[PDB]
């Protein structure tokens, strides 16, 4: 966890809608790291809102048994994702096999 005032995630936090505030919570525990997660609030806003937003649909597509559970999944892959950039984050890289699984 950070420490101090309020940081970039705070700071963005009031630019984002209440859905984008919830999954930056849930990003950053996915990283683990502040610094992991800073480098997410460094990026562009067109670029953060959509990546966000698109974690939410696909978390939004799993609300069932083991929803918990791919919701916690879902996490590692987000990292693994915007590890090499959020320009090409999407349905390419980052979806949830809980409505697609096969």
């Given at each position: 966890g950070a420490m101090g005032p309020k940081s970039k995630e705070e700071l963005l936090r009031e630019k984002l809608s209440e859905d984008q505030k919830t999954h930056l919570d849930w990003l950053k525990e996915a990283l683990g790291n502040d610094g992991e997660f800073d480098k997410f609030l460094g990026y562009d806003e067109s670029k953060i809102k959509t990546a966000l937003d698109h974690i939410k649909s696909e978390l939004d597509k799993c609300n069932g048994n083991d929803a918990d559970q791919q919701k916690t999944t879902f996490k590692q892959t987000v990292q693994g994702a915007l590890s090499?950039?959020?320009?090409?984050?999407?349905?390419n890289n980052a979806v949830t096999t809980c409505g697609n699984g096969s």
């Amino acid at each position: 966890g950070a420490m101090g005032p309020k940081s970039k995630e705070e700071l963005l936090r009031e630019k984002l809608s209440e859905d984008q505030k919830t999954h930056l919570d849930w990003l950053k525990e996915a990283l683990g790291n502040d610094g992991e997660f800073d480098k997410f609030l460094g990026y562009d806003e067109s670029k953060i809102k959509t990546a966000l937003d698109h974690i939410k649909s696909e978390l939004d597509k799993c609300n069932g048994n083991d929803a918990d559970q791919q919701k916690t999944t879902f996490k590692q892959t987000v990292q693994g994702a915007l590890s090499g950039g959020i320009d090409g984050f999407g349905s390419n890289n980052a979806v949830t096999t809980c409505g697609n699984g096969s």
